[PDB]
């Protein structure tokens, strides 16, 4: 319950639309009770009057209350649906923005949980469930409470005992019955979640390993237990509807008890009257209509547990410490970047050596550099600490004679343009996949890049308007790499970080791309990690190294002249 406080405070942005939608729900329910209560009284009042009371009845006042309670019930229902649906989409937008703003400062590290793609499909589902707190939890429960109180208060001007026993029955089953059924079905809802993820775990294994199961003749016996999990899963759902059937038969029995009590008690006297003629129907027809408000309260409290379970999950992610902070100072981005590294761990420690002294690289204001590592020995994590994904625990990373940590976040992204190994194709137009780099850029200047980087094929049909990503027009590694290079060229930054370019590509695209770097990024300082000895002759100051330690370094001719580690690379393997 205390988990929902951060997301209840998001309601302050839209508090008049969210409170109008609850007020309109209360008014609509009160007009339904007030119409059937007035109608019930009017029949018994006119019946006891008879023909004799025809000319001394004053039916004009009820006539103004029967048309009043009809307009506010049809217009109250129409606008309660309208207002509470607009309000629901307002908080969904504000939940998506709030979650995105909290998830971004901790994007690389605090969010890289196991099966991140499967986590994010569970993040989006939790934001949707937090959006259901207003219409599916708060409005039914607050609306029922106010309707009971107004009915109890307004019905107490006739009889305190009768109004308090009717409102006492309705208040007890609003505060005691929803908690009782949540507690009763708590155990059945726990193995229902256990058996649902067991089925998803067994289905994924049976579907992903369909090629392995068919060849080894096990696809039939592993579907047998998959359908056996469904039988147990469907059994737990049967025991969950066995309890929703009870909460609807007991709601009908409680609303019957109120009517029987109103019939029995109001005949012994309403107020001080020994025989209340038309006042029995006023109380009996109030108990008939007032229990419409209590219909959703048990299912609303049931959904509150789901909303709370989502509130802890979202708060687990968002309320993490962003390990990287950026000063709020305006700085001038330089046209030349002289990157220098001092005692920095080029690779995450392997085998827990703890004695790997950081490298001492030095990249001048215009020179290309290629760090030649070995495959599978260790993930780089050098361009991660160079884009301030995390602070370097080893040494100092100075950026143009100044520390990297003393640079504004906005000015840090304008001085470094990194192409990553995993390049993301946003589900948007090709224009939107490239305006990412430069947000203000001419449409023709945008199109010139595509031709320049060897991606003329994307301008054939609906060029710069075709939908990329899940919508369609998927790209392969050869052409998806070119888009990453295209972004780094629109993002005109003095320093370019090349992460494993030309990896997994054929020999033809690799030569077309390495020639792109050498002629496109001629005035820029690139820092490329390859473990591929192709095109390094054009990269001055090659850095060949193993075990996170620079063995030797220099220009390509110097490496071959001394006949060292680099010479064995070309000469042997």
């Amino acid at each position: 319950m205390r988990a929902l406080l951060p997301y209840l405070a998001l309601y302050k942005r839209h508090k008049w639309m969210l409170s109008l939608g609850i007020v309109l729900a209360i008014v609509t329910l009160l007009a339904s009770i007030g119409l059937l209560t007035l109608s019930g009284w009017f029949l018994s009042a006119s019946a006891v009057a008879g023909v004799a009371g025809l000319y001394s009845f004053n039916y004009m006042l009820p006539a103004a209350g029967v048309r009043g309670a009809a307009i506010t019930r049809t217009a109250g229902r129409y606008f309660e649906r309208l207002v509470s649906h607009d309000a629901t989409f307002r908080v969904l937008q504000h939940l998506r923005i709030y979650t995105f703003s909290k998830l971004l400062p901790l994007s690389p590290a605090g969010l890289a949980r196991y099966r991140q793609g499967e986590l994010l499909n569970r993040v989006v589902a939790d934001v949707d469930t937090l959006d259901h707190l207003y219409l599916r939890v708060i409005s039914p429960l607050v609306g029922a409470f106010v309707v009971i109180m107004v009915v109890t208060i307004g019905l107490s001007f006739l009889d305190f005992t009768l109004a308090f026993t009717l409102g006492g029955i309705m208040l007890l089953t609003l505060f005691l019955m929803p908690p009782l059924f949540y507690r009763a079905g708590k155990s059945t809802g726990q193995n229902l979640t256990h058996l649902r993820g067991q089925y998803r775990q067994q289905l994924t294994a049976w579907l992903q390993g369909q090629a392995e199961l068919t060849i080894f003749g096990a696809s039939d016996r592993y579907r047998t237990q998959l359908e056996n999990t469904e039988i147990q899963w469907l059994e737990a759902q049967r025991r969950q509807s066995e309890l929703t059937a009870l909460s609807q038969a007991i709601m009908l029995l409680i609303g019957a008890l109120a009517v029987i009590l109103m019939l029995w008690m109001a005949s012994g006297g309403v107020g001080g009257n020994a025989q209340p003629g038309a006042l029995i129907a006023l109380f009996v027809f109030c108990a008939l209509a007032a229990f419409e408000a209590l219909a959703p309260v048990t299912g609303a409290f049931q959904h509150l547990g789901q909303v709370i379970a989502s509130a802890v999950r979202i708060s687990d992610l968002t309320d993490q410490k962003p390990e990287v902070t950026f000063p709020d100072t305006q700085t001038r981005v330089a046209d030349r970047v002289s990157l220098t590294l001092r005692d920095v761990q080029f690779t995450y420690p392997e085998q827990s050596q703890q004695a790997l002294k950081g490298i001492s690289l030095q990249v001048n204001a215009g020179e290309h550099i290629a760090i030649l590592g070995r495959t599978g020995c260790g993930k780089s994590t050098l361009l991660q600490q160079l884009t301030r994904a995390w602070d370097p625990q080893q040494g100092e990373i100075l950026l143009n004679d100044s520390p990297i940590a003393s640079l504004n976040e906005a000015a840090l992204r304008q001085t470094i343009s990194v192409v990553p190994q995993r390049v993301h194709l946003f589900s948007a137009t090709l224009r939107d996949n490239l305006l990412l780099a430069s947000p203000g850029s001419s449409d023709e200047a945008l199109s010139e890049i595509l031709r320049r980087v060897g991606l003329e094929k994307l301008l054939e049909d609906a060029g710069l308007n075709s939908w990329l990503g899940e919508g369609g027009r998927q790209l392969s590694g050869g052409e998806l790499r070119r888009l990453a290079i295209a972004r780094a060229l629109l993002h005109d930054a003095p320093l370019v970080l090349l992460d494993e370019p030309t990896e997994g590509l054929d020999a033809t695209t690799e030569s077309q791309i390495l020639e792109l770097l050498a002629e496109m990024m001629r005035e820029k300082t690139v820092l490329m990690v390859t473990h591929r000895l192709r095109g390094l002759s054009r990269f001055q100051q090659i850095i060949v190294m193993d075990n996170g330690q620079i063995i030797e370094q220099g220009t390509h001719a110097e490496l071959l002249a001394r006949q060292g580690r680099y010479y064995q690379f070309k000469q042997g393997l």
Partner: protein
């Protein structure tokens, strides 16, 4: 005409699976209408005695008892009708899920790997379960919406025919107000749900790519993009909803008017202003209460049908995905009845082979190779050249329109169940589907001797890293073998393939992205295993293919070069270019 009509039509054609349950719920809903009428009759009768005749409540014990008994019966029927409703939707989901899994196993891995594993769990778990409330609640309610209201009138008409016409007068009006504009804004609502689900994929797209938004400094420009996309959806949805909520508001007007008209008619009939609507026997107070008590329940089944709107809306969206899934045409590989005579190494033959995807696309062009029995061959080439398609076609996962003869017998004519017992495979991705590490190795034959398990564990070098596992050979691999690394999970796949003898061993880049140690142990076991039967290995480790007697260079789905390493490395052709490009990886 409308897409939503052929989806609601599809949903009812699926409802015949549990028609006994829907008929019981329709019969129990008719019993509810009788008990609602009887309950209102004992209330109207009691109220008349207590108001007009001033009868003390202690002399009305018999009508009070009958009113309590008919309330308990009403609660019992609701309990029964709610449990019967679940059984209707459960047996429909169980049969559709069986159809989806049957159709997803017939298609095979050739079609399963087209979409991510999460895209298939969504269709099977989340989307099939989205249809339950349509069969459990909406269909029983839409049958109640015609049974109870027409039964209320039949009970009011004998007592008073003017109160019956008030309810029956609005009976055809209500349908033409939510079918004139309601049907106009019903498919529009269905498209709004698609937009909401698509807007939910625009949020997930921005979440999945915040590593790219971070490095480009576009974090504050995608908050506006979320704001713009969310505001465009709401503005478009609320304009549709301004017409779709009229049906809810109109139905609330006609239940208000009918309650008012019943009160006005009966109220002024007691005062003597009106003298019609009865059978000249005089209007009583019980006649007016019976109509007034039953006036809300004339419209309640229709008012509760709007509560169940999302049950239908979320099932039409689910039926949208499940109707296209069950109606896409797939090209299954033709299966025969013939069996192979002996378990000796098979001979592979091709003659203008054309591998075809399940959607009909041609994967590999004309192949005219020939692999004698017991000979070890290598498939090489650039990515996307059809090397895995040739292995998938030999496994029986892909259909071909040429010649592919195993020991002289076509592969179409071979029975897939008995062919694959003469076949072992490793695959590009391990995919250990069993529970523990021991059950994954024994997947070929679970009931094998403990000694034979140790022989396979030792040959594949799985035994050497077993002490490093918390539980040993019984260590659960977990979700997608996350417990053990890819290099040591690939050795479990190797031990699985070597547990049973085979006539053909298919290796699909078995050492692609392993660490340098598992590179050694896998190729140690697989070079020794390739000598015992016919073997076809796909690889890019072109340096080690010296003792393999056949090398096929596959490009653009076509084998463009054949020969051994001695003559291919020096010929300066397609393989020399591939070898030269391979020599740069360190």
């Amino acid at each position: 005409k409308s897409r939503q009509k052929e989806l609601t039509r599809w949903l009812k054609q699926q409802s015949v699976i549990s028609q006994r349950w829907l008929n019981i719920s329709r019969l129990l809903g008719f019993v509810s209408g009788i008990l609602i009428i009887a309950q209102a009759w004992f209330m109207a009768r009691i109220l008349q005695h207590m108001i007009m005749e001033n009868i003390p409540r202690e002399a009305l014990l018999l009508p009070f008892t009958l009113l309590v008994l008919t309330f308990v019966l009403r609660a019992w029927v609701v309990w029964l009708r709610e449990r019967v409703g679940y059984h209707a939707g459960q047996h429909i989901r169980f049969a559709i899920r069986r159809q989806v899994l049957d159709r997803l196993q017939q298609a095979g891995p050739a079609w399963i790997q087209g979409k991510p594993a999460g895209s298939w769990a969504t269709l099977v778990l989340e989307q099939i379960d989205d249809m339950h409330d349509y069969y459990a609640r909406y269909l029983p309610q839409m049958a109640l919406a015609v049974s109870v209201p027409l039964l209320i009138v039949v009970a009011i008409f004998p007592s008073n025919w003017a109160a019956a016409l008030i309810l029956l007068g609005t009976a055809p009006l209500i349908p033409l107000f939510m079918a004139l504009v309601g049907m106009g804004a019903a498919d529009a609502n269905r498209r709004n749900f698609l937009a909401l689900a698509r807007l939910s994929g625009h949020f997930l797209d921005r979440l999945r790519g915040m590593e790219t938004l971070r490095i480009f400094g576009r974090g504050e420009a995608e908050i506006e993009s979320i704001r713009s996309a969310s505001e465009d959806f709401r503005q478009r949805t609320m304009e549709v909803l301004r017409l779709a909520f009229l049906s809810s508001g109109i139905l609330e007007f006609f239940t208000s008017l009918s309650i008012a008209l019943v009160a006005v008619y009966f109220g002024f009939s007691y005062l003597g202003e009106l003298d019609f609507g009865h059978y000249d026997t005089g209007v009583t107070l019980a006649a007016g209460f019976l109509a007034l008590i039953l006036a809300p329940e004339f419209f309640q089944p229709l008012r509760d049908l709007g509560t169940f709107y999302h049950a239908k809306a979320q099932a039409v969206g689910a039926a949208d995905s499940l109707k296209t899934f069950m109606e896409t045409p797939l090209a299954h590989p033709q299966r025969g009845e013939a069996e192979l005579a002996s378990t000796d190494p098979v001979t592979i033959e091709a003659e203008e082979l054309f591998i075809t995807s399940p959607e009909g696309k041609t994967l590999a062009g004309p192949l005219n190779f020939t692999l004698p029995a017991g000979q070890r061959a290598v498939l090489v080439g650039r990515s996307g050249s059809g090397k895995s398609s040739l292995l998938n076609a030999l496994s029986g996962f892909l259909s071909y329109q040429g010649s592919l003869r195993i020991n002289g017998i076509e592969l179409r004519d071979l029975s897939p169940e008995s062919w694959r017992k003469h076949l072992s495979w490793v695959g590009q991705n391990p995919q250990l589907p069993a529970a523990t590490l021991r059950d994954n190795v024994l997947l070929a034959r679970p009931d094998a001797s403990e000694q034979e398990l140790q022989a396979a564990l030792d040959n594949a070098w799985v035994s050497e890293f077993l002490p490093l596992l918390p539980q040993g050979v019984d260590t659960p691999v977990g979700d997608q073998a996350a417990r053990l690394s890819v290099g040591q999970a690939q050795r479990v796949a190797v031990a699985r393939a070597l547990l049973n003898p085979c006539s053909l061993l298919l290796l699909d880049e078995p050492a692609a992205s392993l660490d340098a140690h598992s590179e050694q142990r896998v190729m140690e076991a697989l070079n020794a295993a390739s000598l015992r039967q016919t073997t076809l290995m796909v690889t890019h480790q072109l340096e080690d293919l010296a003792d393999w007697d056949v090398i096929w260079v596959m490009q653009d789905g076509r084998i463009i070069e054949q020969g051994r390493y001695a003559e291919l490395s020096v010929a300066g052709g397609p393989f020399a270019t591939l070898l030269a490009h391979r020599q740069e990886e360190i």
